[PDB]
């Protein structure tokens, strides 16, 4: 998950072509993360270990 609510800001960079940046972030600032269930990861890793 990327919990920050980024917003895209359009900028016009040269004739007839645009560049898209990030504008203000709505809300509060938070960290990006990934979750895994650790008992299932442990069982899986032990199963690799027996091989």
């Amino acid at each position: 998950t990327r919990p920050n609510n980024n917003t895209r800001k359009s900028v016009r960079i040269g004739p007839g072509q645009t560049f898209y940046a990030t504008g203000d972030i709505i809300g509060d600032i938070k960290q990006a993360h990934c979750n895994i269930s650790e008992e299932k990861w442990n069982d899986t890793l032990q199963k690799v270990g027996i091989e």
Partner: antibody, heavy 126, light 110 residues
Framework: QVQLVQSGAELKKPGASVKVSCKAS????????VHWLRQAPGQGLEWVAW????????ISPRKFQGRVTMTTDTSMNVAYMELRGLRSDDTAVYFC????????????????????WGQGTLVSVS | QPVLTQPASVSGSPGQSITISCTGS?????????VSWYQQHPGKAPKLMIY???KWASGVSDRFAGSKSGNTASLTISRLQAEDEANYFC??????????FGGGTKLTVL
């Protein structure tokens, strides 16, 4: 047990400034966001701002942008909210309140889940 | 920016049911289900009585319903007793990352 003891009331000239402080009791201020609220005589509850007391990051809706400036001193465990450029409207009962728990992975800053409230302190105007 | 609305004053009947509602925009009510209901007596501080529509607040009797529908939400009080003589504010959060209150409504006697 919880308390959000606020500072006393104080009347000011319109266009003046005032610092309003909100004390923590029974918990450390760094856990929760601090929301600032108001109630004029005979009017409803008006939402003013929140502060994430750790980073000092704040948002106020539109009406108070520039009016309200924010600080905290978590060593003293106190939260402050300063108003400038007063008007007759500011005869109102400001409340401080703690909102959501601060979690590094989910944004609870912005939604109306006020647990406990300040007793009420009155910025006033002649 | 505050826009949220509700009937400014109504009356109930003991033992019956009354509807106390609020309305907004898809930006703040239908965008997310984050809603709560508050009781404040004059001379005292408020008291959260609903949050997230129907997560159960402390000390709330089963009279106090909590529902949401699209652009609207309501406390559909049932059995509607008299010891709640002060107002019942609505509140929701906007997609602009702000909290909004209603104009308050009085659960009058009753």
């Amino acid at each position: 047990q919880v308390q959000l003891v606020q500072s006393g009331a104080e009347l000011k000239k319109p266009g003046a400034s005032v610092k309003v402080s909100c004390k923590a009791s029974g918990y450390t201020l760094s856990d929760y966001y601090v929301h600032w609220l108001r109630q004029a005589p005979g009017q409803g509850l008006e939402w003013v701002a929140w502060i994430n007391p750790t980073s000092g990051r704040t948002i106020s809706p539109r009406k108070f942008q520039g009016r309200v400036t924010m600080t905290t001193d978590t060593s003293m465990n106190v939260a402050y909210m300063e108003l400038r450029g007063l008007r007759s409207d500011d005869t109102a009962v400001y409340f401080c309140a703690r909102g959501g728990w601060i979690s590094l992975y989910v944004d609870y800053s912005y939604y109306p889940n006020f647990d406990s409230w300040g007793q009420g302190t009155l910025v006033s105007v002649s | 920016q505050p826009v949220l609305t509700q009937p400014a004053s109504v009356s109930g009947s003991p033992g019956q049911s009354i509807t106390i509602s609020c309305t907004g925009s898809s930006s703040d009510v239908g965008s997310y289900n984050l809603v709560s209901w508050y009781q404040q007596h004059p001379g005292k501080a408020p008291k959260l009585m609903i949050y997230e529509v129907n997560k159960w607040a402390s000390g709330v009797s089963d009279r106090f319903a909590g529902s949401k529908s699209g652009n609207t939400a309501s406390l559909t009080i049932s059995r509607l007793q008299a010891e709640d003589e002060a107002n019942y504010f609505c509140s929701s959060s906007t997609n602009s990352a702000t909290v909004i209150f209603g104009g308050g409504t009085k659960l009058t006697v009753l």
